[PDB]
Structure formats: C-alpha cells, structure tokens
C-alpha cells in the first residue's frame, strides 16, 4: 500500500542522508594516518567527498577542503610502546613544546576581523566608547595563581567589539610586561582574580604577542592552549 511504500522509500531517503552527512564531516582530519604519519590501510567504507571551496572575506583568499593535511611544526612526542594505540611521552616540556592538553594549532598569524574589516579583538583602552557596564570590574585587580601567590595585576580587558563581549585580561607581570589570559579560565572575585590553571611561576611562560593592540588567531591558540595544559602539568603545585 501507499503507506508501506512511503515508509520504505523514506528509509532509503534516510540512509542517503546519513551518507551525505558522514562524508561532509571528513573535509578535515581525513585521511587517517598510521602512528608514524603514513596513510592508513583501512579508510573505512566512506569516501573523501569532492573538494569544496570557501571564498574567505576581505581578500584574505580561499580555503579548499578536503585539503592537503599539514601539521606545520615539530612534535616532541615518542612511543612508550612497541604496538599501536598507546600514549606518546613528551620528549621534554609539553607546555613549551605545544603538546597534549597544551597543544596549540598553526592557524594564520592574522587576527579575526569583524565584518567591516577592522580588527575584531581589541583591548579596551583603545576600544572607543567601551566600558564595563556591569559586574565586578577586574581592572587594577591582583592576579593569583593556583599555588596562591600573586603574579601580576589587571591593566585592561580585551573585548569582542561586535559581540560586545569579554574574552581576555591583559596581565602586567612583576617585570613590567603583559600577558593575556582567557576570561573563560579565570574566576573574578571581590578582591582578586583567581586562575586555577596556572601557578605564579608559569605566568611568565605564557607566550607573547608581537602586536600590543591586536592578537592573531594563531596567537590566541598558543595562549589558551598553554593555559589549558596547565590543568594537568601544573597540578604538582596546585
């Protein structure tokens, strides 16, 4: 009958959607690599879709995926075992090295733009008409690490001009230089900012920015990432 028909035919329609879906989700990461980075034997049942092209904005070019996969950097990791699927020891210092939780990616050394073409992320003191409009303002407030020691203080907040939102806290260290911290990784309080992730002494390690009035995508990752990694490598002091 018309109802049996329709219920099968949908199944078919449903299978095919699954396909389309599954594939579409491989334009990155694929193809799989063996534990030495050489292509993999079994690529599964699903094929690499035919490449599609993103016309980036503000003449910054084009993106085409699937694309030629490149880590574009050194991985201080080595096997801890003979057969596959094991951990991969960090030859040295995972923080500095950029591995594991701290890992950071090679994203363009350019900053995110808004839709007008001017820097998306700016630092307050240069953000025209941008003020704290509610909540406990952290400016001037002292930064305390996970070991409970002071490490610098807050001198400015960087904000997502368009989404009028707060993503960072320029921190002035003991040696007059500043480090950016990830809002989402701080815990502003009444009398202090508290960073669980890092201890006083690593605050320095936080990578730096070349420009003091902008931050490149690539730059954000390195920071946050480093920051993150703190959660597990900074634990013997927290």
């Amino acid at each position: 009958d018309l109802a049996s028909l329709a219920i099968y035919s949908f199944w078919i329609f449903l299978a095919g959607l699954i396909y389309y879906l599954q594939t579409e989700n491989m334009r990155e990461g694929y193809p799989l690599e063996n534990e030495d980075g050489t292509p993999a034997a079994n690529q599964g049942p699903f094929p690499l879709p035919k490449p599609k092209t993103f016309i980036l904005p503000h003449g910054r070019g084009t993106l085409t995926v699937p694309g030629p996969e490149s880590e574009d950097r050194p991985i201080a990791l080595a096997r801890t075992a003979v057969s596959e699927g094991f951990p991969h020891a960090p030859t040295g210092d995972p923080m500095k090295d950029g591995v594991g939780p701290a890992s950071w990616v090679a994203r363009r050394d350019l900053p995110e733009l808004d839709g007008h073409g001017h820097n998306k992320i700016k630092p307050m003191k240069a953000a025209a008409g941008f003020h704290v409009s509610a909540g406990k303002n952290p400016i001037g407030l002292p930064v305390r690490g996970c070991d409970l020691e002071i490490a610098g203080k807050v001198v400015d907040i960087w904000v997502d001009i368009p989404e009028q939102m707060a993503r960072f806290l320029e921190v002035e260290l003991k040696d007059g230089s500043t480090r950016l911290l990830p809002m989402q990784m701080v815990k502003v309080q009444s009398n202090r900012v508290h960073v669980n992730a890092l201890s006083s002494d690593l605050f320095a390690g936080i990578p730096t920015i070349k420009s003091p009035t902008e931050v490149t995508l690539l730059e954000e990752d390195k920071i946050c990432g480093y920051v993150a990694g703190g959660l597990m490598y900074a634990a013997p002091k927290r």
């Binding site: 003020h131 904000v159 368009p162 009028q164 502003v188």
Partner: protein
C-alpha cells in the same frame, strides 16, 4: 571550583552596532532600542534594531487580526465578563465549522465561519512571514537555509489545518483554536485512528524530537567546554581550524567511534530537527485517508 561560562562574569558595552548593510534598504530599519543588563548575563544585551518592510507589516497585521478574532469570540463566550474570561480562559474555544458544511464558505458566523475568518488571517500571516525570512536572507546575500528549515514546519502546519482537512472532505477535521480543547483534539485523533504509538511516521517523529534534545544537548555542552579555546567562533574555526574544533573532535571520536566537523555538525543538527515536522506532516497525512486504524496496519503492513 571553576568558571562554567554559563553566564558571563562581567558585562561590557559599547555603542550600538546598527548591523551590516549590503543591499538592505536602511530606510525601513527601525531605531535602536535600549540595552538590558538582563539578557546580558546570557547573551547580547543589545536590543534592536528591527527591519520592518512592507511584508513585515502585512504578516504582523494579519497576525493580530488572527489573534484578535480569537479574542472577540472568547469575550463572547465569557459573556463579556472579565473574571469569567480569566477563569475559563483555557476552556474557551473557536471550533471549526460543522461536518455538514464540509469544505464550504457559507458556514454561519457562530458555527465555523468565525473559525474560517481566523484561519484566513493565520495563513497569510504565516506565509507572508516565511517570505520575509527569505528576502532578509537575500538582502544579506545569505543561505536560504533558514527560509527552508522553516518551511519544514509550515509543512506540518499545512497538513494539520488545510491539506489533511481537504482530504477528509470537511473543515470539521481541522484543529480548533483553544487551549485545552486542541490538546484533546490531539488525544482524540489518536484514538480515532487506532493508536498512534503504532503509526510509524509517528514512532519516527518521536525519534527526532527526542533526537534533537540529544544532539543539541551535545553541541552546546561541547562548544562550551572548548570555548576556553575560542570555540564559540564556529565560523572562523571552519575557515581556519583551531584546537577548539580539533579537541571538540577527538573527544567524540575517542568516545563514540567517530566525529563531525565545525561546518558539518551544523548540518547534522539542521536535519535532526527539520525532520521532526517532516516525518510528521507525513504520519498525520496518512492516518485516516490512507489508513483508518494504525494497530491493524501494524499487523498487515497494508
């Protein structure tokens, strides 16, 4: 304990971003509204502006008439008595016209003819409205995705109160504007065609509705644990993957045997849901006209 970026900890404001512009006609743009310090703990604090084209008016205009026509009659039943109105607010109901009238436009005001009026407006206000979301998307040279997804509903809506009703010969088969009444209308329709737990396009719709609450529950929990990596910016991760999407990835693939992408996950979703009202529009569309009892057909499959 840590920051769950569920609510921000500090708010910040700057002037009003009157929004991009492209082909959009800024003349029909409205003036900006005020900033709430409320929504601000959750999302933006900026209210407005709003684009009210000719369509924006139409749709909204019929929108009220519709909503109003229902008011008048609720006022009629309450005998123009306020307290009543407030008491029986839920039991009131503008029912469709009677089975005898079938699909005719003669029905006397008090019996269907006022229900027709009201529908007439609702159509117009729903279609004109859809339409707007087209143009707006066009004025933004953007993907008619939205305009399409919405259609998916209009679907179920269209069957629920026009298609299905035209296929069973009478206006008395449609739903009535009422708070408890329609509730029941559903229940009855369940019993009037075997049990709906059986109608499979319904077993299915369940799946997706449910499914959308499974998926969305994920995507959000996720995006949120990887914001500390500027992940909320799904757009710019797409174009230049970050550790955000990488990490978003490997968690799921080290969890459930696979993974999506930043563009991709957005297509799952979109469907996962567009399908609730799709499978549906079918399910209902079939019961009665093509299948008078669903239990039965659960035995024969025809």
């Amino acid at each position: 304990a840590e920051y769950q970026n569920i609510f921000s900890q500090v708010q910040v404001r700057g002037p009003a971003d009157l929004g991009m512009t492209e082909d959009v006609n800024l003349a029909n743009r409205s003036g900006v509204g005020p900033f709430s310090t409320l929504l601000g703990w959750f999302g933006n604090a900026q209210l407005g502006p709003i684009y009210l084209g000719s369509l924006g008016v139409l749709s909204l205009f019929s929108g009220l008439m519709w909503f109003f026509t229902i008011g008048i009659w609720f006022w009629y039943q309450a005998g123009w008595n306020p307290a009543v109105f407030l008491r029986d607010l839920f039991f009131f109901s503008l029912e469709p016209p009677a089975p005898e009238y079938g699909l005719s436009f003669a029905a006397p005001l008090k019996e269907g003819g006022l229900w027709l009026i009201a529908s007439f407006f609702m159509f117009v206000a729903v279609w004109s409205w859809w339409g707007r979301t087209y143009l707006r998307a066009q004025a933004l040279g953007m993907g008619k995705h939205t305009a399409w997804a919405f259609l998916s509903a209009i679907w179920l809506w269209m069957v629920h109160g026009f298609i299905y009703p035209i296929l069973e010969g009478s206006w008395s088969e449609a739903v009535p504007y009422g708070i408890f009444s329609h509730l029941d209308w559903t229940n009855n329709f369940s019993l009037v065609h075997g049990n709906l737990h059986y109608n499979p396009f319904h077993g299915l719709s369940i799946a997706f509705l449910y499914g959308s609450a499974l998926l969305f529950a994920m995507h959000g929990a996720t995006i949120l644990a990887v914001s500390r990596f500027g992940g909320e910016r799904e757009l710019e991760q797409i174009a230049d993957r970050g550790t955000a999407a990488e990490r978003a990835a490997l968690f799921w693939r080290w969890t459930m045997g696979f993974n999506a992408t930043m563009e991709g996950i957005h297509r799952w979703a979109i469907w996962m849901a567009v399908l609730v009202t799709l499978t549906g529009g079918i399910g209902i569309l079939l019961s009665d006209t093509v299948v008078d009892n669903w239990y039965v057909w659960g035995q024969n499959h025809g």
